[PDB]
Write a protein that binds this ligand. Structure first.
Ligand SMILES: [Mg+2]
Ligand SMILES: [Mg+2]
Ligand SMILES: [Mg+2]
Ligand SMILES: [Mg+2]
Ligand SMILES: [Mg+2]
Ligand SMILES: [Mg+2]
Ligand SMILES: [Mg+2]
Ligand SMILES: [Mg+2]
Ligand SMILES: [Mg+2]
Ligand SMILES: [Mg+2]
Ligand SMILES: [Mg+2]
Ligand SMILES: [Mg+2]
Ligand SMILES: [Mg+2]
Ligand SMILES: [Mg+2]
Ligand SMILES: [Mg+2]
Ligand SMILES: [Mg+2]
Ligand SMILES: [Mg+2]
Ligand SMILES: [Mg+2]
Ligand SMILES: [Mg+2]
Lengths: 117, 56, 110, 150, 142
RNA sequence: ACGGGGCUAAACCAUGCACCGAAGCUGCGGCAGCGACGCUUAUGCGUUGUUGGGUAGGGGAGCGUUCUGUAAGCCUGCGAAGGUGUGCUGUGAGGCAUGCUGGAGGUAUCAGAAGUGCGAAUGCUGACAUAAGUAACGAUAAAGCGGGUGAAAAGCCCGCU
RNA sequence: CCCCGGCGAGGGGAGUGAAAAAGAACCUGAAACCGUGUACGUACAAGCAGUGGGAGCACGCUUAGGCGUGUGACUGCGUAC
């Protein structure tokens, strides 16, 4: 019962080379290099699904800080004011309001300043 | 001395970017026979500047 | 109406013929024949015979006229290589590749 | 593998992977690492496990109504046309026929029929009783089978 | 719903004038770096230059504390062996006064193509006059 | 001999309050293991607790390949295998459908048997790259011209040097 | 059989055949490797070449659907097996 490996070996080499589309040079042409590139790409993707949640929160905080200082208060005192006012809007929404609705964001600063004062 | 890494096809193409041939700009036209020829060269039938210079 | 002529197994490497091929890519056949006449290259003689043979095919098989033909497509593919043995110093041997090429010229009025 | 035991090239200095034989299984045209030998695949079956399986098969056949019992089953001349006609009367196409005494006429008449085969009472085997859609046994055969299976 | 991102085609940039007379070099440079990068705008995005154009006047009148006027040294290497050049603060002021502020801000900007693009929006002048009146730059009392 | 810019605090000490900050914790959704309690099992479902980084290594459960039976069955010239795309699908090995190519075989299911899965062994064989149109063209005794032949002549023929 | 070519090689027609992209370097014709065409990117820019974010452009849509596909300026992180 001799088993020739040609059909299944080509199938799995194509499966790797298909995931390597768009890589430079041998990384999208030859299996040995493409296989390492695909594994490394999977490692980065796993790591960056966690980093994505840090980078976006870091971006929201920066935008909130900018919009808060336009109203005369820092991000630190603004967040502490909202918690003292029992407001539970998260940073993704606050950064969203800070860009698309200035007057609603100013109303939030007034609410935060009242809880501090 | 020899390469430590195989140069890419990209690097190979960049080196050959100066290997392109330059075609002759324009051929001259003889005033007598009207043939085309390299400037300052006699024509294929032995004319140069409107004169049969070689009878072959 | 495209018209093709080919020279397969031309005794010249594709890299050398491609230098001549890009001189006439897109030119009118009357202008291309003058370029090939005054190109001091061996490949220029090979390409010229394929070009003028494509012109003959266009006028005899397709009834086209020479005045409107243009070199719309031209490319040189690698042909089979002939393996040869060249003796080197100290009893070592090297394998010499006598490369060939396939020359393809496509003329068309459109 | 036909070849020489000569070392293809010296151990050190050539700059190639070390080799010891042109017959190595790593090499093209080399030997097979664990080349097969003519072997015997027959297994042992306990006498009671064999007989115990026939009883379980026979009892399953009567539960599936795949066992047909007749008093006798024979044909006059060894002609497959007669036997093919007889089975069509009984609405049987794929059937194993088991008789007490193996008649030559019944044996010859079934030789060319593909989905039909005759068998002596002592010649039954486990896969035949399962492979066929119907099993027709004469009253003499079932009597002999009971003595065989205690 | 994806987070908003500014677009280089639709971002507006204002022009500002800053008088560096008497300002502390570093505490002025940080405020410039913020506005050159756009950290003061709610539409700030890291990969887009949303900053403002800033004109700095009287760069030669910038102030430093301590003995830094004579002790702060600016090093740079010319790339030739042994070519390590140095210049103290007050001779940098005497020779190229605009370089002092440009160097300080350059160090506070991100490094890379975008950081170099932000630096182009900084116009530093030694004197009190500038020829960008056509841009109508607004006084930035910082 | 602050990571840099820079800093006379953006240093240090004391005290205080905020905030940032991890794959930690919480929230929401999903999977699996082990318990427990049961439904009441037909032996699975349901609650509940808890666990789920991992080399050497131990244990458990699978995918796919060739071949045998099932199979004188089923699929197939109204297009098989193979090749090449695409879409869908499963936790994974994978699977399903389909366009094109191909032009004659393929094979469910459940079992059975293995030459059963490759990126490495300075592995073996074939093909093709790279260096690169680079070095070299094998004695520094040496060639020049006219004519001829020829699709084409520095090298062949003839002639004179 | 005709045409180009050196009474070549090679090729284009015609014809044969179900098929000539079955033409004898002949079933199928994978990959490395080498080309032609088109879309996008690329000549102030530093490093395992990806990954997360992401403009613009091109194109398929649907169609105001605001989706798909290709490309990937710029930016966070990131020293193969
Ligand atoms: Mg977190
Ligand atoms: Mg032998
Ligand atoms: Mg053998
Ligand atoms: Mg026995
Ligand atoms: Mg956790
Ligand atoms: Mg584990
Ligand atoms: Mg198919
Ligand atoms: Mg291999
Ligand atoms: Mg390995
Ligand atoms: Mg080589
Ligand atoms: Mg070199
Ligand atoms: Mg040289
Ligand atoms: Mg040389
Ligand atoms: Mg010689
Ligand atoms: Mg002569
Ligand atoms: Mg011919
Ligand atoms: Mg073929
Ligand atoms: Mg540029
Ligand atoms: Mg980095």
């Amino acid at each position: 019962a001799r088993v020739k490996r040609g059909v299944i070996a080509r199938a799995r080499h194509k499966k790797i080379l298909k995931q390597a589309k768009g890589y430079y040079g041998a990384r999208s042409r030859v299996y040995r290099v493409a296989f390492q590139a695909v594994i490394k790409a999977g490692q980065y993707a796993y790591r960056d699904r966690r980093q994505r949640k840090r980078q976006f929160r870091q971006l929201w905080i920066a935008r909130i800080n900018a919009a808060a200082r336009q109203n005369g208060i820092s991000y630190s005192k603004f967040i502490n004011g909202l918690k003292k006012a029992s407001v539970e809007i998260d940073r993704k929404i606050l950064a969203d309001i800070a860009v698309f609705d200035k007057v609603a964001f100013t109303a939030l600063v007034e609410k935060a300043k009242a809880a501090l004062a | 001395a020899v390469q430590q890494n195989k140069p890419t096809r990209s690097k190979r193409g960049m080196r050959r970017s100066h290997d392109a041939l330059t075609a002759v700009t324009s051929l001259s036209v003889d005033k007598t026979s009207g043939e085309k020829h390299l400037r300052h060269h006699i024509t294929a039938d032995g004319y140069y500047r409107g004169r049969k210079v070689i009878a072959k | 109406m495209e018209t093709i002529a080919k020279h397969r197994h031309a005794r010249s490497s594709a890299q050398k013929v491609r230098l001549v091929a890009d001189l006439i890519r897109g030119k009118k056949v009357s202008q291309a024949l003058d370029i090939l006449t005054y190109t001091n290259k061996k490949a220029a003689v090979l390409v010229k015979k394929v070009l003028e043979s494509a012109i003959a095919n266009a006028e005899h098989n397709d009834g086209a006229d020479i005045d409107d033909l243009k070199v719309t497509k031209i490319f040189v593919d690698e042909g089979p290589s002939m393996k040869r043995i060249m003796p080197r110093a100290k009893g070592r041997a090297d394998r010499i590749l006598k490369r060939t090429s396939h020359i393809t010229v496509v003329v068309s009025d459109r | 593998v036909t070849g020489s035991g000569k070392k293809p090239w010296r151990q050190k200095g050539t700059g190639r992977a070390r080799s010891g034989s042109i017959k190595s299984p790593i090499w093209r045209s080399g030997g097979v690492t664990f080349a097969a030998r003519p072997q015997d695949h027959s297994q042992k079956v306990n006498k009671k496990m064999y007989r115990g399986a026939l009883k379980s098969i026979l009892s399953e056949l009567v539960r599936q109504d795949r066992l047909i019992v007749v008093e006798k089953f024979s044909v006059e001349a060894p002609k497959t046309k007669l036997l093919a006609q007889k089975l069509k009367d009984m609405a049987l196409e794929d059937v194993l026929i088991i008789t007490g005494e193996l008649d030559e006429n019944l044996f010859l008449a079934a030789r060319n029929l593909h989905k039909v085969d005759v068998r002596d009472a002592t010649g039954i085997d486990p896969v035949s009783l399962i492979a066929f859609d119907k099993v027709v046994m004469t009253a003499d055969a079932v009597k002999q089978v009971e003595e065989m299976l205690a | 719903m994806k987070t908003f991102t500014a677009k280089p085609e639709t971002v507006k940039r204002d022009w500002y004038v800053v008088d560096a007379t008497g300002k502390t070099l570093g505490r002025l440079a940080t405020e410039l770096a913020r506005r050159l990068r756009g950290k003061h705008k709610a539409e700030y995005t890291p990969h887009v230059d949303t900053g403002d154009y800033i004109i700095v006047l009287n760069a030669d009148k910038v102030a430093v504390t301590g003995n830094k006027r004579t002790d702060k040294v600016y090093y740079h290497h010319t790339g030739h062996i042994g070519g390590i050049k140095q210049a103290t603060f007050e001779e940098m002021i005497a020779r190229r006064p605009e370089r002092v502020i440009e160097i300080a801000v350059k160090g506070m900007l991100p490094k890379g193509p975008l950081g170099r693009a932000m630096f182009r929006k900084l116009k530093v002048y030694a004197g009190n006059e500038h020829n960008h009146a056509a841009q109508q730059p607004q006084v930035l009392d910082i």
